Amino acid sequence: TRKAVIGYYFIPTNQINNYTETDTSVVPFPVSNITPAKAKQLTHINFSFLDINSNLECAWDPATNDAKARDVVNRLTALKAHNPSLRIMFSIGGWYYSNDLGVSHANYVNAVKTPASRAKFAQSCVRIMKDYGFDGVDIDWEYPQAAEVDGFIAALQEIRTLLNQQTITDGRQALPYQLTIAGAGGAFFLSRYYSKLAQIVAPLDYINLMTYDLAGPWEKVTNHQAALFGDAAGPTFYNALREANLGWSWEELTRAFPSPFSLTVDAAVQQHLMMEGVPSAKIVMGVPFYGRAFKGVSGGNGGQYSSHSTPGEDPYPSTDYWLVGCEECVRDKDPRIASYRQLEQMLQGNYGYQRLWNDKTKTPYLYHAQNGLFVTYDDAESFKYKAKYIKQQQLGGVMFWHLGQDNRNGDLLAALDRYFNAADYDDSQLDMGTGLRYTGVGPGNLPIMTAPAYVPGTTYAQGALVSYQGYVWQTKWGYITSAPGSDSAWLKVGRV
Amino acid sequence: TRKAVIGYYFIPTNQINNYTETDTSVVPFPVSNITPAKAKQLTHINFSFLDINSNLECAWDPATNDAKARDVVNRLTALKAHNPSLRIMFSIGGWYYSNDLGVSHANYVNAVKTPASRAKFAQSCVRIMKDYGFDGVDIDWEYPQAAEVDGFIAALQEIRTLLNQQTITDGRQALPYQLTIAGAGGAFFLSRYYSKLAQIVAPLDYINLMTYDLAGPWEKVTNHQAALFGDAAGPTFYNALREANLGWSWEELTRAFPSPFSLTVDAAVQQHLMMEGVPSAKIVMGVPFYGRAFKGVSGGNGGQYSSHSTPGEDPYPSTDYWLVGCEECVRDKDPRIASYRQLEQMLQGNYGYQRLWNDKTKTPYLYHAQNGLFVTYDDAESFKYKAKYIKQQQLGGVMFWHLGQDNRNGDLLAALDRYFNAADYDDSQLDMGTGLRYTGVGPGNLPIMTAPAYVPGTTYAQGALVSYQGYVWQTKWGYITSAPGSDSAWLKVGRVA
Numbered sequence: 001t002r003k004a005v006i007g008y009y010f011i012p013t014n015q016i017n018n019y020t021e022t023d024t025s026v027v028p029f030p031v032s033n034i035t036p037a038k039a040k041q042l043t044h045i046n047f048s049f050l051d052i053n054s055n056l057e058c059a060w061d062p063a064t065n066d067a068k069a070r071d072v073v074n075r076l077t078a079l080k081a082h083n084p085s086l087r088i089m090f091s092i093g094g095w096y097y098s099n100d101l102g103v104s105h106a107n108y109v110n111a112v113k114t115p116a117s118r119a120k121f122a123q124s125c126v127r128i129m130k131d132y133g134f135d136g137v138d139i140d141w142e143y144p145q146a147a148e149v150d151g152f153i154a155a156l157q158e159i160r161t162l163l164n165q166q167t168i169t170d171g172r173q174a175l176p177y178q179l180t181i182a183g184a185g186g187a188f189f190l191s192r193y194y195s196k197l198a199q200i201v202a203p204l205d206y207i208n209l210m211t212y213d214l215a216g217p218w219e220k221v222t223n224h225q226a227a228l229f230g231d232a233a234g235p236t237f238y239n240a241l242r243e244a245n246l247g248w249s250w251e252e253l254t255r256a257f258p259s260p261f262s263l264t265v266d267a268a269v270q271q272h273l274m275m276e277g278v279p280s281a282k283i284v285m286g287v288p289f290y291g292r293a294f295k296g297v298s299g300g301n302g303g304q305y306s307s308h309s310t311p312g313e314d315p316y317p318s319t320d321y322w323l324v325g326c327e328e329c330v331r332d333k334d335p336r337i338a339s340y341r342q343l344e345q346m347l348q349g350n351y352g353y354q355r356l357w358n359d360k361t362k363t364p365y366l367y368h369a370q371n372g373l374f375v376t377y378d379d380a381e382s383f384k385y386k387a388k389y390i391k392q393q394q395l396g397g398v399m400f401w402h403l404g405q406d407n408r409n410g411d412l413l414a415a416l417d418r419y420f421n422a423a424d425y426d427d428s429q430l431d432m433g434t435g436l437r438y439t440g441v442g443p444g445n446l447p448i449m450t451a452p453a454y455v456p457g458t459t460y461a462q463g464a465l466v467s468y469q470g471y472v473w474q475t476k477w478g479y480i481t482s483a484p485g486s487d488s489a490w491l492k493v494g495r496v
Numbered sequence: 497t498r499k500a501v502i503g504y505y506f507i508p509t510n511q512i513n514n515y516t517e518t519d520t521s522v523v524p525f526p527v528s529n530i531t532p533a534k535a536k537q538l539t540h541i542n543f544s545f546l547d548i549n550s551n552l553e554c555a556w557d558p559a560t561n562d563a564k565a566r567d568v569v570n571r572l573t574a575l576k577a578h579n580p581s582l583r584i585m586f587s588i589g590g591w592y593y594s595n596d597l598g599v600s601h602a603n604y605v606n607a608v609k610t611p612a613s614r615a616k617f618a619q620s621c622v623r624i625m626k627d628y629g630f631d632g633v634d635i636d637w638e639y640p641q642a643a644e645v646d647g648f649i650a651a652l653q654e655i656r657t658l659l660n661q662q663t664i665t666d667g668r669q670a671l672p673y674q675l676t677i678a679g680a681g682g683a684f685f686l687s688r689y690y691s692k693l694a695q696i697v698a699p700l701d702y703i704n705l706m707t708y709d710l711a712g713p714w715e716k717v718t719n720h721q722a723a724l725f726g727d728a729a730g731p732t733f734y735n736a737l738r739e740a741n742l743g744w745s746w747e748e749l750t751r752a753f754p755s756p757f758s759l760t761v762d763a764a765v766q767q768h769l770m771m772e773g774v775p776s777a778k779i780v781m782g783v784p785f786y787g788r789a790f791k792g793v794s795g796g797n798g799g800q801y802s803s804h805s806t807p808g809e810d811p812y813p814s815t816d817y818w819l820v821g822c823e824e825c826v827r828d829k830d831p832r833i834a835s836y837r838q839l840e841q842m843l844q845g846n847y848g849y850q851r852l853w854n855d856k857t858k859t860p861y862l863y864h865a866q867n868g869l870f871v872t873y874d875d876a877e878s879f880k881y882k883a884k885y886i887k888q889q890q891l892g893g894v895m896f897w898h899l900g901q902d903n904r905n906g907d908l909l910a911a912l913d914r915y916f917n918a919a920d921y922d923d924s925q926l927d928m929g930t931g932l933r934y935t936g937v938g939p940g941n942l943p944i945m946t947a948p949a950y951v952p953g954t955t956y957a958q959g960a961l962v963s964y965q966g967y968v969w970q971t972k973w974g975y976i977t978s979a980p981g982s983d984s985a986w987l988k989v990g991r992v993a
């Protein structure tokens with residue numbers, strides 16, 4: 001099955017309203033930059049962003065020029081002429097609109113509140129999809145909290161029911177309308193709905209993990225924002241999942257959630273696979289097409305794992321654009337984020353940056369010895385390991401933010417496509433390294449095991465293994481006289 | 497309120513059938529050994545044991561000569577003439593009959609299954625109580641678990657309803673019929689029903705904790721079987737309550753159930769108090785009137801916390817009676833258990849035992865250097881600390897197994913009575929020591945705390961404290977923008993005044 005390659009196409013309202021493909025000073029990344037070759041390398045483009053308004057319906061930004069918007073969307077759907085499997089999804093939400101303190105947060109919370117609000121909301125999603133010509137619905141609420149989860153689930157189920165009906169009504173059996181969400185790629189946010197992951201994922205074609213931004217100026221120590229595996233020399237974190245509303249025992253929580261742990265892409269993927277009913281094929285690994293920059297770092301480890309003096313606030317609370325050589329940073333008044341495109345230019349420019357590689361995390365980073373700068377980003381090299389991991393772990397594919405940050409030749413996108421599909425690319429010998437793997441074990445990833453059948457009336461010592469009701473169980477203490485499942489002295493440790 | 501002093505009177509069916517008060521070779525402990533003085537020192541005598549039959553009704557062992565049974569019970573109820581507060585309870589169950597592998601286990605499980613079976617069982621408990629002249633019902637099922645607990649709770653509620661009506665019918669308001677149970681005194685068995693303790697205890701006058709047998713041949717390291725407090729030098733154990741179906745978060749489980757911990761009397765009592773709705777006044781501390789002996793122990797520490805070579809099988813699998821001077825052991829064919837009466841005689845027999853004291857656990861122990869023996873038991877001195885603990889903790893009283901193991905003069909019972917009621921006994925200055933106290937805290941026994949009210953729209957740093965909806969909450973990590981409650985980021989740490 002072809003791996004999904006989902007790229008976000010984000011365009012601010014002001015750019016839509018002034019849309020042009022001949023002046024990058026107004027629209028830096030027009031749809032025409034998505035050449036036929038690039039359209040063939042994508043399976044999905046997530047058009048973004050739409051929102052949920054006070055009327056609790058899916059809708060464009062009020063300031064949007066509709067004829068302009070439709071024309072932009074039509075240019076994107078026209079790309080399908082180059083790739084019959086291509087889908088132009090539209091995404092609702094994103095951090096700005098939907099974070100707890102975001103301008104539209106209330107609408108997300110209220111829209112999923114009742115059977116009626118959900119019905120109205122779900123209907124608007126499908127209506128918007130059909131009217132503008134999109135191929136699916138993607139919801140990026142960052143993120144529903146514990147009490148809002150059931151409503152969120154019910155809303156996704158409603159959208160799924162309606163989409164499946166629309167696919168039949170439109171004869172799209174060959175390319176069904178889809179439903180996806182951008183899910184948390186770190187344990188802290190994931191813990192909000194983690195306990196109901198199976199229900200959240202059931203109505204979806206894919207759950208696209210934002211397995212990046214795992215480091216940022218809000219953190220005291222600089223770190224890789226998307227390390228595939230862990231580096232013991234880097235910071236470790238409190239494992240928030242052991243505090244999720246799971247209802248599991250101390251032993252169960254502890255073995256599934258070691259704490260502290262390395263916040264990596266592998267951690268997030270494994271944490272999802274630990275839950276039963278969460279199929280690997282629906283998990284999509286997100287990767288960033290931009291780097292995060294920090295200033296005020298010291299030496300010793302190339303800028304890694306150092307204290308820093310980078311403002312964490314949004315908007316950038318200053319006019320000091322200190323990321324040397326970063327022109328886009330001045331355009332965007334923020335030296336803390338730089339697109340791969342810009343980073344590549346900074347490296348070939350003799351600005352003082354040294355590209356280094358951490359072979360445990362399997363990611364690159366820049367260090368500016370003279371000015372004390374550190375940049376954590378991804379490139380075609382780090383993508384080799386992520387792509388192999390996606391294949392080895394049987395994941396659904398890759399998602400990335402965002403298309404306008406790839407270089408002009410579309411090299412990052414082309415690398416991902418190459419790793420999955422080129423007949424002449426062979427990663428059978430690519431060494432995945434010794435970086436730390438997430439070792440938690442949960443109900444969803446129990447190892448296959450064998451054990452004598454449990455015998456009613458038998459007394460077992462501590463550590464005894466038996467098979468019962470399809471699983472292998474082990475005693476937590478001694479003199480066990482009851483059966484697995486009826487006696488809380490037994491820990492389920494294997495399956496089959 | 498007077499502290500309860502509940503003593504078990506246990507008599508095997510063969511002794512009942514051959515009951516006599518003039519041959520200790522046949523009946524080692526006849527009711528006649530309970531003088532008026534002893535009857536006045538007791539508030540309850542738990543006659544034991546009756547059982548639950550295959551018809552799922554409370555019943556005497558079928559091999560019991562009924563007339564002889566009524567006569568033994570009559571002798572006990574006759575003691576009420578010496579003490580208008582005394583109750584002769586009868587106990588259903590006990591280890592032999594009701595443990596998972598016991599001969600009658602299935603009957604306990606099945607009797608509590610449905611409204612019908614529970615009504616039939618409860619009615620039989622009251623019928624037996626009235627037919628033989630008992631003053632209450634005590635149930636010693638060791639122990640209900642899992643899916644059995646709700647039935648067990650409903651059975652207890654039904655018996656309570658029937659007993660209360662019986663009290664009115666009989667004009668027994670001055671001495672109401674009572675209902676109690678013998679409860680686990682250690683976390684492993686306690687974890688079976690721990691999560692529903694409040695419901696179990698609601699219908700009871702007392703829950704009598706079997707806070708002893710916390711050490712035994714089944715354990716690889718010798719230890720005190722009823723340490724009041726912990727000794728950091730002794731063995732520690734896995735805290736099984738961490739595995740009970742409570743629905744608490746990892747932090748809550750960790751805070752409530754330190755592990756490993758010292759398996760002690762204080763730990764059991766505190767574990768019960770940790771649960772919301774369990775009043776201290778209904779908790780009864782059980783104490784042993786017998787000691788447990790081990791052989792093959794190493795010296796250097798009075799035989800404490802040593803490796804040993806004591807058989808664990810039951811019955812005692814050998815003919816070798818190695819507890820020096822314990823003739824009772826020969827009679828009973830087991831050198832691993834000795835009554836305090838017998839242990840006291842061994843200490844007066846110049847047999848080479850040293851009586852030592854652990855000032856952390858507040859319990860005595862015997863050490864036989866020459867033969868490598870260790871005996872953990874309780875005596876009048878350890879009872880001073882336990883009695884003070886019962887007073888300080890506002891517990892309901894003390895329970896003990898069993899009357900026949902006190903010495904002929906009834907000294908251990910007299911001590912307990914003295915510590916609670918004598919005008920001339922003063923423990924105001926008794927030093928409770930520095931042994932380890934159980935310090936877990938559960939969402940149900942949180943301290944009063946004070947903190948600013950939560951402010952919606954605020955971002956909280958790690959460790960921040962706020963008050964919200966009756967509780968004080970602490971953030972477990974930073975950048976918290978969510979409200980206290982189910983949200984995983986917040987931890988309930990205290991109650992708002």
Ligand SMILES: O=C1N[C@@H](Cc2cnc[nH]2)C(=O)N2CCC[C@@H]12
Nearest residue numbers: 094095096140142182210213401
């Ligand atoms: O709003 C966005 N913002 C960026 C950055 C980011 C958001 N949440 C975490 N990181 C992104 O990657 N996106 C992925 C989908 C949401 C969209």
Ligand SMILES: O=C1N[C@@H](Cc2cnc[nH]2)C(=O)N2CCC[C@@H]12
Nearest residue numbers: 095096213214216218312314975
């Ligand atoms: O400020 C944040 N930002 C998001 C990511 C993001 C994407 N675009 C903007 N912000 C995050 O992961 N966070 C972690 C905690 C701070 C919080």
Ligand SMILES: O=C1N[C@@H](Cc2cnc[nH]2)C(=O)N2CCC[C@@H]12
Nearest residue numbers: 590591592636638678706709897
């Ligand atoms: O069966 C029993 N046997 C003894 C010993 C023991 C039982 N469970 C743990 N220890 C006892 O104390 N009992 C207290 C009530 C049950 C009665």
Ligand SMILES: O=C1N[C@@H](Cc2cnc[nH]2)C(=O)N2CCC[C@@H]12
Nearest residue numbers: 479591592708709710712714810
């Ligand atoms: O073997 C056991 N015996 C019981 C006590 C008992 C009383 N009379 C006989 N045995 C006990 O407390 N246990 C604790 C665990 C071992 C188990």
